[PDB]
Amino acid sequence: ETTALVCDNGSGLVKAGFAGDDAPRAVFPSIVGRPRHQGVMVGMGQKDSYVGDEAQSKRGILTLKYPIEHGIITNWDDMEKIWHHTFYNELRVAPEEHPTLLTEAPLNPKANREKMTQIMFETFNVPAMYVAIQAVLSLYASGRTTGIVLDSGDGVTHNVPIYEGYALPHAIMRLDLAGRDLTDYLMKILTERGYSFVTTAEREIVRDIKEKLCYVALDFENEMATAASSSSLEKSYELPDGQVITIGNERFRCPETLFQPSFIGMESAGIHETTYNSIMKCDIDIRKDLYANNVLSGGTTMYPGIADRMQKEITALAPSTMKIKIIAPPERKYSVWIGGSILASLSTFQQMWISKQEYDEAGPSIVHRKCF
Amino acid sequence: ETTALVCDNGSGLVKAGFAGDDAPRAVFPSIVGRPRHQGVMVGMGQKDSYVGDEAQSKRGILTLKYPIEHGIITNWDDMEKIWHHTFYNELRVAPEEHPTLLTEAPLNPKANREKMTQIMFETFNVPAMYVAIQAVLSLYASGRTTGIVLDSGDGVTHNVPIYEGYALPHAIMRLDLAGRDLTDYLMKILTERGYSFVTTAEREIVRDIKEKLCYVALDFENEMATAASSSSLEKSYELPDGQVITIGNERFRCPETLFQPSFIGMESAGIHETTYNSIMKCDIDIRKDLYANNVLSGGTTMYPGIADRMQKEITALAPSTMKIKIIAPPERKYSVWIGGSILASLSTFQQMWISKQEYDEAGPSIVHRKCF
Amino acid sequence: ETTALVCDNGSGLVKAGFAGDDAPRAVFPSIVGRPRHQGVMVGMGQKDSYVGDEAQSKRGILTLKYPIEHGIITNWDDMEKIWHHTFYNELRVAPEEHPTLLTEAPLNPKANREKMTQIMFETFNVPAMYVAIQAVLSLYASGRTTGIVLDSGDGVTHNVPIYEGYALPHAIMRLDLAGRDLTDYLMKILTERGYSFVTTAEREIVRDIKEKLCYVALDFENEMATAASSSSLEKSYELPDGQVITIGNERFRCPETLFQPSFIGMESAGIHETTYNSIMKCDIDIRKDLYANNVLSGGTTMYPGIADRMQKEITALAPSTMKIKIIAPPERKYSVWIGGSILASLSTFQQMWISKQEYDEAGPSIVHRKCF
Ligand SMILES: Nc1ncnc2c1ncn2[C@@H]1O[C@H](COP(=O)(O)OP(=O)(O)O)[C@@H](O)[C@H]1O
Ligand SMILES: Nc1ncnc2c1ncn2[C@@H]1O[C@H](COP(=O)(O)OP(=O)(O)O)[C@@H](O)[C@H]1O
Ligand SMILES: Nc1ncnc2c1ncn2[C@@H]1O[C@H](COP(=O)(O)OP(=O)(O)O)[C@@H](O)[C@H]1O
Ligand SMILES: [Mg+2]
Ligand SMILES: [Mg+2]
Ligand SMILES: [Mg+2]
């Protein structure tokens, strides 16, 4: 088919569309909800479960459950239902007349890819498919060849150093600190002021609060000293019922745990330290082009002032002679999808799909020896 | 053809050009590298190998390999690739419409010259060719007729005593100490300060450090005593990644192993003793002109103060009545190519080529009987 | 004193004892852990740090840090604490009334030895001391005089060719691939099955499973083909919490990085190839005894079937006429300590110590001129 489906499936969001476009047409949260109450009324549609915005609208009754956890798929029936919703009820295109493109984080269990390709070749009967790393697709979107990518989505944060068309597999780091931990920490620290949120429906509200009211502080101690005279930092948010919530230092305390994982109990290095270490694991004469090309991807990298603090933190480690620049495109959120769409439409790539006949003979193990 | 090709082919560098000029136009390292990594990106030219500066600029990915070792050519396909790069992509001239001149170190395996002739007559279809010793060409460059030449390049160091128009083949010495062992010894003793270099790419960095930061000391014990108060000898170098490396007595410890091969494990004599022994092997009535005419050639002899120490070392052995003079032209590096260009353009030499029809009947054995 | 301490200090383990014995009485891991948590309870022992087994038993709380990295001591205070624990709280012997013997890998920074002497002479006030290479001590333990020793410990692997009482310093090779890289690679490849270990307390568990469940395969591709029908290779291990972990081809995949360093990205040759190159670096008339005397030392050389593969690989390189034998004593781990104890008790060696009055005049620089 001339147009191929590219369906990026992250840990928190589902973004799908067609190859060759610029922005996806189908974007929605990747949750599945089920009723947990009596259901006295008769004659109303007794749907077993709701997926996507249909569940986000009635979360008040349901019990939302994310099928993807830290990139790992736990419940596969929910994943099949979500894929069905993307293919039929959201994109209105049959899957057996188009090839599909998939994304999956590096350093992941091998059974995940085999089960993904088995599902897509059995329950959907697609003609071809291909799985690609998020970081290489994000680099494809930026129209570059050398540099490192810090992809920070909802479940995993990882780095992939890429030189002029070549990848270094030994320098690929991966830490399991992501947006879900940020939301959990915000929920935990919001009880100091008195506001308590427990259920998944309230977890969605806390995530919404984090999305549009939190910023990264360039300096932490100075900002804390400024917030000590709590006059110019407190904002307000509106609850669905009508109550007003005010927060102070939690605007910058919550996003700082990326740079200081010790706050949430993890013993590890911050994102700046991880990317510096990933730089240092490469050769010596290719470190300059990595320093000069720092690409920010993912949805968690949209906090205001993140780049201005990352530059200072990395400069504090790198030698003074080198110059440091981080790339902050205005379209961080859909960079992986844009790169996948660009790769799918390329005329060179169309000979590296996985045809149905090849899987019929090589079996599900074809992904490991044909995709990476 | 009025203008003949002269492509001097040393063990470390390739310098090619046109007969009749003063300096070669094509000079570049003689290395061939190959990728060793994944190659995940598509659409970028997947070249199998890179030759010359194209590989020197990307050494960070490849694994560089010198095809010529101690003057002995081990891999012939790499040599064919090197010659192809010299002729087509760097000199922009056809090889089948020009005659070529080649150089090789004396006391060499007989297979090398016949293989070179066969390759040049089969894969390139040259009309004529000729092979000559480096030392005699270096003598030609200086415009002299009597004297000895110490050629010290990258793989071999040798001597050729020459009286008026005649050569003494029994007095030709050859020791296998050259620049490569110098870089290896510098790498070995550079670990004392903590800096460790292992791979080939770092070997090039160490070679660059040696080329512009090492000098020959007139006295060794006095210089070591001076460096004991390590204040006035330390310098600094800038690594590609930005780190600063400082070295002390390693500036003069490394170049001395030419005068003292016992440091690097070999139980032989130094270059001064080698040239003195080569002088003494000739007749008695021709020694004075040899003492008065000492010609220094090659790239290894570019260390500052080498002539001042060689003069003292040779004088300490020779009888006090005789006078010692060593010539150190500002253009040691390209003396062999200059002499080759001078000889090629000479009208007398135009009868000592090797015609293609001569090779068609004599076979590859014509070189041994028509070149030396 | 009649009895002298021989306190061997490797990069992963500390083994100390008394001269004249057969096995050391003091063996413990060389780690220093510090608390990282609140410490709400009052009245309990608030020790700043724990050393040795006292920290190995409470790793669940602490953050262990190795003071020695690749033979180089980075943090000197931790080394002082470890030596204090070794002398007082584990051996119960005052250090000022006994002489001590130390070991250190070759081709090491010069500051290391002099700082070690300075520590031992200022902050312990020992009467005399001496440092020695591990390989020569391992040869001493075996009761031989000619042969090469491949010492493979935790941080460094090195070779020392030894003829009849003489050492060839130009043939000493050293690669930085050792057990720590083995553990890191095992951690990296253990995540394919789903199990992920990140913390140092989990690094200890990974080292433990590596120690007693991994073996070296004689043939790699045949073993992979056998493991394809994964029935007869899988084993089971018990993590402390209670779960079960089972692995397949990881039993032999990780050991093999000694022979194929390209798996971990390093551009070097295998240990067999480094040993062969070190053999070929010597003279021609001494290679026979080196071939006929191969001594294995270190703790990394205890993988089952290592000798059966090393002998095959070495025979595949050496000429067929020569016979190859490899010594695999049942006491590889403590061979260095045994050799040190043997040498310390020797009567001839008694005149080669470093007296305190000599250090008071010559200074810390006496080690370089009186030890090697
Ligand atoms: N404007 C924003 N400000 C702060 N955080 C955001 C914003 N938009 C999204 N996020 C965070 O990004 C996460 C979603 O990342 P996502 O784009 O789904 O990555 P992926 O598609 O790779 O899973 C959410 O958990 C949310 O907390
Ligand atoms: N300026 C310099 N100072 C010191 N050594 C040099 C310098 N330039 C070149 N060399 C040494 O000379 C070697 C190259 O010699 P080269 O001119 O290629 O001889 P040939 O052409 O006969 O091979 C290099 O290995 C390098 O170590
Ligand atoms: N039984 C065993 N099997 C496999 N590996 C082992 C075994 N015992 C120890 N090791 C390895 O040896 C290393 C320790 O070496 P060690 O004896 O400390 O050398 P050194 O004392 O010279 O530092 C550890 O990293 C461990 O992985
Ligand atoms: Mg993403
Ligand atoms: Mg030369
Ligand atoms: Mg050891």
Numbering used by the authors:
A (entry chain D), B (entry chain A), C (entry chain E): 4 to 373, 376 to 377
Task: List passages from the publication reporting this PDB structure.
Myocardial force production is derived from cyclical interactions between myosin-containing thick and actin-containing thin filaments. Thin filament-based regulation relies on troponin-tropomyosin (Tn-Tpm) complexes that span the length of filamentous actin (F-actin). While the association of Tpm with F-actin is highly dependent upon electrostatic bonds, both short-range van der Waals (vdW) and hydrophobic forces also contribute to the total interaction energy.
Both wild-type and mutant F-actins exhibited similar overall features in cryo-EM micrographs, consistent with the mutation preserving filament formation function. Using the helical processing workflow in RELION, we resolved actin structure and connectivity in wild-type and A331P filaments at up to 3.5 Å resolution, enabling us to build atomic models of the complexes. Overall, both structures were very similar, exhibiting an alpha carbon root-mean-square deviation (RMSD) of 0.536 Å between the two. Direct comparison of the atomic models of residues 320–335 from wild-type and mutant ACTCs surprisingly illustrated that the backbones of their surface strands were nearly superimposable. Therefore, to investigate potential A331P-induced changes in protein dynamics, as well as possible structural alterations not readily resolved in our F-actin reconstructions, we performed MD simulations of wild-type and A331P ACTCs using models derived directly from our cryo-EM-based maps.
